[PDB]
């Protein structure tokens, strides 16, 4: 039967695939690094190779070239998390990030603005340590928020919105400021989306999300966290 060599350092991704392959009549062998991959290919061969692009020691890039050097027969499919391809282009090209295209222009602008303010660090924007305002605490470097207890998923946009409001506690931020920061650039329907997001935060942060007293609207101006 067709032989699949799975080269993968996450046992919990590899084992279920290996299970399914086997129940479907394929042979599957799982190995966890480049040396073990090359030894097993030489021992037994493989018809299909599924290759983790980021491995400890010998890079997946080098494993791939070495397998291909041995035979033109095997199908070799390289696999990577967003975070692994980001690491690989850093090590291999000196790139700061990899992004799959078509991508939202505005979202890319929001990421550019973030880089320029050293986004994701407590020590950015002349601050230090965890942000606090009323019962809300935000650990920016760890990406966690509590409202006494740890507050559930904040989707990314809600987190960014709250961070920007907490960093400017007691001061009004305008719709334009808030939109540029969280969504990147102004766009059709942005004011409504901002308000939906403010209301979602309110339901997670406020004693009564109906008459809010912490995340308030400043009519004609924008929003403020007191």
- Residues near La ion (CB under 5 A) are 9, 52, 54, 82, 86, 97-98, 180, 186
Q: How many residues does the chain have?
A: 226
Residues 180, 182, 187, 193, Cα dihedral to 10°: -140
Q: Which single residue is written with the structure tokens 């990314």?
A: 156
171 secondary structure, DSSP code: S
Compute the distance between CA of residue 141 and CA of residue 40 in angstroms, rounded to an integer: 42
Residue 64 or 205 having the CB closest to its own copies:
64
The answer to whether 47 and 21 have CB atoms below 8 angstroms apart is: no
Asked if 144 contacts 150 with a C-beta cutoff of 8 angstroms, the reply is yes
Instruction: Pick one of its own copies, La ion, none as the site partner of residue 9 (Cβ within 5 to 8 A by kind).
Output: La ion
Question: In the set 44, 91, 115, 221, which binds its own copies (CB under 8 A)?
Answer: 115
Minimum CB–partner distance for residue 112 and its own copies (Å): 6
Tell the smallest beta-carbon distance from residue 178 to La ion (Å): 10
Pairwise CA distance, residues 114 & 111, whole Å: 5
Q: Which residues of 127-148 are buried (b: 16+ CB within 10 A; e: fewer)?
A: eeebbebbebbbebeeeebeee
Judged by beta carbon distances under 5 to 8 A according to partner kind, the member of its own copies, La ion, none in contact with residue 189 is none
In the complex with La ion, which residue's Cβ is closer, 129 or 155?
Answer: 155
Q: Give the residue with the Cβ less far from its own copies, 34 or 212.
A: 34
Instruction: Name 194's Cβ contacts closer than 8 Å, sequence gap at least 6.
Output: 161, 175, 178, 179, 182
The H or E element containing residue 145 is: strand 144-147
Per CB under 8 A, the segment of 30-38, 78-86, 139-147, 214-222 that binds its own copies is 78-86
Minimum separation from the CB atom of position 151 to its own copies (A): 26
Q: Which is nearer to La ion, 175 or 204 (CB)?
A: 175
Closer of 99 and 216 to La ion (Cβ): 99
Beta carbons of 10 and 55 less than 8 angstroms apart = no
In the window 140-199, what residues touch its own copies (CB under 8 A)? Answer: 180, 184-185
Site residues for its own copies, 9-48, by CB under 8 A, read: 13, 16-17, 20-21, 23-24, 26, 48
| Binding-site ranges for its own copies (CB under 8 A) | 2, 4, 13, 16-17, 20-21, 23-24, 26, 48, 50-52, 61, 64-65, 67-69, 75-82, 84-85, 89, 92-103, 105-106, 108-109, 112, 115-116, 180, 184-185
């Amino acid at each position: 039967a067709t032989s699949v060599l799975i080269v993968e350092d996450e046992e919990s991704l590899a084992d279920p695939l290996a299970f399914l392959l086997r129940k479907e009549g394929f042979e599957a062998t799982v190995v966890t690094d480049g040396p073990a991959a090359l030894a097993e290919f030489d021992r037994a061969g493989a018809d299909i190779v599924l290759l983790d692009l980021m491995l400890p020691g010998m890079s997946g890039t080098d494993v791939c070239k070495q397998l291909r050097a041995r035979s033109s027969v095997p199908v070799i499919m390289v696999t990577a998390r967003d975070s692994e391809i980001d690491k690989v282009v850093g090590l291999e090209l000196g790139a700061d990030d990899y992004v799959t295209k078509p991508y939202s222009a505005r979202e890319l602008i929001a990421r550019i603005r973030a880089v320029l303010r050293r986004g994701g660090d407590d020590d950015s924007e002349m601050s230090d340590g965890v942000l606090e305002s009323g019962p809300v605490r935000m650990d920016v470097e760890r990406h966690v928020v509590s409202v006494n207890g740890d507050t559930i998923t904040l989707p990314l946009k809600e987190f960014d919105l709250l961070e920007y409001l907490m960093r400017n506690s007691g001061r009004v931020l305008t719709r334009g400021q808030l939109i540029d920061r969280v969504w990147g650039a102004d766009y059709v329907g942005d004011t409504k989306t901002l308000d939906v997001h403010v209301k979602r935060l309110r339901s997670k942060i406020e004693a009564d999300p109906a008459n809010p007293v912490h995340l308030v609207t400043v009519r004609g101006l924008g929003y403020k966290l007191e």
